[PDB]
Amino acid sequence: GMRRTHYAGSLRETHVGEEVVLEGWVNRRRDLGGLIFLDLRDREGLVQLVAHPASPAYATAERVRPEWVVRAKGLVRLRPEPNPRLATGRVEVELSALEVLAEAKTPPFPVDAGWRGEEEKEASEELRLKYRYLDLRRRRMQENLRLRHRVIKAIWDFLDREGFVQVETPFLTKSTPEGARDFLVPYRHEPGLFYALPQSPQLFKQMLMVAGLDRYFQIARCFRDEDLRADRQPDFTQLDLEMSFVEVEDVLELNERLMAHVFREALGVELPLPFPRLSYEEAMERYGSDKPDLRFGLELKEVGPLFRQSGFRVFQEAESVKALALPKALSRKEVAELEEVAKRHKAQGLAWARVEEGGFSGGVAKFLEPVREALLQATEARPGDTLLFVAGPRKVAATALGAVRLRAADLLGLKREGFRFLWVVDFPLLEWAWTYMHHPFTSPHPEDLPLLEKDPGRVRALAYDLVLNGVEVGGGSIRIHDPRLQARVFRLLGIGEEEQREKFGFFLEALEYGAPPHGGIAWGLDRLLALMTGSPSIREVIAFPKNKEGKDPLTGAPSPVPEEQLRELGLMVV
């Protein structure tokens, strides 16, 4: 068996009197009163070792240095005074033996403070990535990686109980000139031919439905060689799943229970079911975003039809006027800050007014008095609030005041806590020629089918986004399983036969052999884990990520190769 009797961090008062053998890293050394104190560290926490002058381990304990690997043997004793900041805080190990298994260079940054329950000073992330094997020693990084383990195991437990089959799909697959750029992999035996890394398992998981497996899932790696701004990594992890004989409601209900199971098991958090649902239109109208942050209120209100008789030209002639009531009298500085946020989102400006006990004052207050009673009933505003207005095209006015709404939450210091999931449903299928939103296999709404050719912009898709605290963490749809409907959607998009066969030939042929009704979703697992941990970047929930630029400071990739290794592939740099 092993030489150690326990994880160092697992010792408690229940272990007093036992002789233990421990192995780990020297977190810190302190000399007090002629005793040598060593914080011994492993993944379960710190435990205090004490060397007394008479002990055989005394000289060894004096020479050891931070991050040295040691094996320690001694008796578990009670501390005279407990340190409540350690789970082992009531006990210590009186050393009889101490053996050095590895010395260590002074690390480029400290990794010891979190294990004592102390705040850790921010270090250069580039430094942290270059020495990531040391960065991963820190308590916070190990908790993130172990939560990610618990989340994936919980996904496995749940989906296995619900009859899902995990299926692993190819990594070396067909490159298509369709949309997002592929990472390529040269085929050595025939120069000029390339595999591609997969953008997602979409076509394979649909083909697994055509194969009759009924329900599938995979913790899938997706590779997309595009802009790496906005926290993107060159590859990321999805929870990918697909089901047969389902409606939208079936997919949402399954994913709700799975998510609630994941949060209960991996975080100890209870998520009330069902999640709230909002159509795309409702989300845009009430929050100005298709990923609403539900951790605070302050909904947008359409007040356009209140000013159709008002002399205020800019309100009267606008297609939309959105209003927002902030529960605070803003400074002129804050208003101009919100105005700049609005103008940065294509708005012509931001009108404003304070609401007093009898009327309004400031900004556009004069033009608000004739409609006072109606305006207050629509906005539910009270004396002391500030009313913000954006007038313009409907999408612009909503999106601009929605961004104002988010920035206003920070100005007001609103407490945004917990986890607020919601479904955004009934997205438009297309957008102006015409083009689809995600991928062309998304089914139109059955009752909107006749509008496909008549009024395409009004056609709803059977697609849905999962949103958590203003962040898209999941997206999916019911798929087309009728090849004639799929051809009909292609004819509407202007996508000819030669283009279909080149991009999708093998899958379109698959639909001719009896595809069941099916649909699915993929979660952004790294995004979910970052949100579950309050991390500012998905880099904090990935063991060995790339930096914001796409490179790996730890190993140096991407790096050149000997020209003989490249000549062997039949390629050269131009």
Ligand X SMILES: N[C@@H](CC(=O)O)C(=O)NS(=O)(=O)OC[C@H]1O[C@@H](n2ccc(=O)[nH]c2=O)[C@H](O)[C@@H]1O
Number of residues that bind ligand X (CB under 6 A): 21
Q: 48, 35 in Cβ contact below 8 A?
A: no
Q: After which residues does a break in the chain occur, C–N more than 2.5 Å?
A: 432
> Minimal distance in Å, beta carbon 220 to its own copies?
11
Stretch that binds ligand X, among 123-131, 301-309, 342-350, 472-480 (CB under 6 A): 472-480
Is 481 labelled a binding residue?
no
C-alpha closest to that of 36 among 48, 24, 20, 19: 48
Q: 462, 480 in Cβ contact below 8 A?
A: no
**Interacting partner of 474 out of ligand X, its own copies, none (Cβ under 5 to 8 A depending on kind):** ligand X
Residue 560 is a binding residue for its own copies (CB under 8 A):
yes
| Contact string 477-516 vs its own copies (x = CB under 8 A) | ----xx-----------------------x---x-xxxxx
The two tokens of residue 204 are 């394979």
Is 438 labelled a binding residue?
yes
Return d(Cα 460, Cα 281) in angstroms, integer.
Answer: 11
**Interacting partner of 232 out of its own copies, ligand X, none (Cβ under 5 to 8 A depending on kind):** ligand X
| Window 8-37: residues binding its own copies (CB under 8 A) | 23-25
Residues 48, 55, 60, 169: which binds its own copies (CB under 8 A)? 169
C-alpha closest to that of 73 among 103, 38, 105: 38
CB contact set of 27 (below 8 Å; sequence gap of 6+)? 39, 40, 41, 46, 66, 112, 115, 116
Residues 55, 206, 386, 477: which binds ligand X (CB under 6 A)? 477
When the beta carbons of 432 and 513 are compared against its own copies, the nearer one is 513
Stretch that binds its own copies, among 3-11, 73-81, 395-403, 432-440 (CB under 8 A): 3-11
Residue 458 per-residue DSSP state: G
**Interacting partner of 185 out of ligand X, its own copies, none (Cβ under 5 to 8 A depending on kind):** its own copies
| Window 424-463: residues binding ligand X (CB under 6 A) | 438-439
| Window 496-535: residues binding ligand X (CB under 6 A) | 520-522, 524, 526-527
Is 226 labelled a binding residue?
yes
C-alpha closest to that of 141 among 408, 554, 481, 541: 541
Cα 275 to chain centroid distance, Å, stands at 18
| Window 201-240: residues binding its own copies (CB under 8 A) | 204, 207-208, 210-214, 219, 221, 223, 225, 234-235, 237
> Minimal distance in Å, beta carbon 90 to its own copies?
24
Is 178 labelled a binding residue?
yes
Return d(Cα 546, Cα 96) in angstroms, integer.
Answer: 45
Residue 475 is a binding residue for ligand X (CB under 6 A):
yes
Q: 258, 158 in Cβ contact below 8 A?
A: yes
Residue 84 is a binding residue for its own copies (CB under 8 A):
no
List phi, psi (to 5°) of 540. Answer: -80, -15
When the beta carbons of 74 and 444 are compared against ligand X, the nearer one is 444
Neighbours of 49 (CB within 10 A): 27
Q: 89, 83 in Cβ contact below 8 A?
A: yes
> Minimal distance in Å, beta carbon 520 to ligand X?
4
**Angle value at C-alpha 470, between 468 and 476, nearest 5 degrees:** 60
| Window 153-212: residues binding ligand X (CB under 6 A) | 178, 200, 202
Is 479 labelled a binding residue?
yes
Q: 86, 49 in Cβ contact below 8 A?
A: no
**Interacting partner of 281 out of ligand X, its own copies, none (Cβ under 5 to 8 A depending on kind):** none
Return d(Cα 196, Cα 431) in angstroms, integer.
Answer: 29
Cis amide leading into 558 (omega within 30)? yes
Residue 81 is a binding residue for its own copies (CB under 8 A):
no
| Window 252-291: residues binding its own copies (CB under 8 A) | 253
Residue 473 is a binding residue for ligand X (CB under 6 A):
yes
With CB atoms as reference, the residue minimizing the distance to ligand X is 524
Return d(Cα 465, Cα 412) in angstroms, integer.
Answer: 29
**Interacting partner of 103 out of its own copies, ligand X, none (Cβ under 5 to 8 A depending on kind):** its own copies
Is 524 labelled a binding residue?
yes
> Minimal distance in Å, beta carbon 232 to ligand X?
5
Residue 95 per-residue DSSP state: E
Residue 162 is a binding residue for its own copies (CB under 8 A):
no
Return d(Cα 358, Cα 458) in angstroms, integer.
Answer: 44
| Contact string 394-433 vs its own copies (x = CB under 8 A) | ----------------------------------------
DSSP-assigned letters across all residues of 409-450: HHHTT----S--EEEEE--BSEE---EESS-TTBPBPGGGTT
When the beta carbons of 182 and 293 are compared against its own copies, the nearer one is 182
CB contact set of 561 (below 8 Å; sequence gap of 6+)? none
When the beta carbons of 526 and 540 are compared against ligand X, the nearer one is 526
Is 472 labelled a binding residue?
yes
**Interacting partner of 472 out of ligand X, its own copies, none (Cβ under 5 to 8 A depending on kind):** ligand X
**Which residue's structure tokens are 């957008």?**
431
Neighbours of 87 (CB within 10 A): 16
The two tokens of residue 548 are 């914001």
When the beta carbons of 239 and 365 are compared against ligand X, the nearer one is 239
When the beta carbons of 304 and 516 are compared against ligand X, the nearer one is 516
Strands (E), 56-120: 69-78, 91-102
Evaluated on CA atoms 381, 383, 385, 389, the torsion sign reads positive
When the beta carbons of 269 and 543 are compared against its own copies, the nearer one is 543
Pairing of strands 69-78, 320-326: unpaired
Neighbours of 63 (CB within 10 A): 12
Residue 196 is a binding residue for its own copies (CB under 8 A):
yes
Number of residues that bind its own copies (CB under 8 A): 121
Residue 232 is a binding residue for ligand X (CB under 6 A):
yes
CB contact set of 163 (below 8 Å; sequence gap of 6+)? 214, 215
Q: Which residues bind ligand X (CB under 6 A)?
A: 178, 200, 202, 224, 232, 236, 238, 438-439, 472-477, 520-522, 524, 526-527
Q: State the binding site.
A: 178, 224-226, 233, 438, 472, 479, 524-527
Q: State the binding site for L-aspartate.
A: 178, 224, 438, 479
Q: State the binding site for ATP.
A: 224-226, 233, 472, 524-527
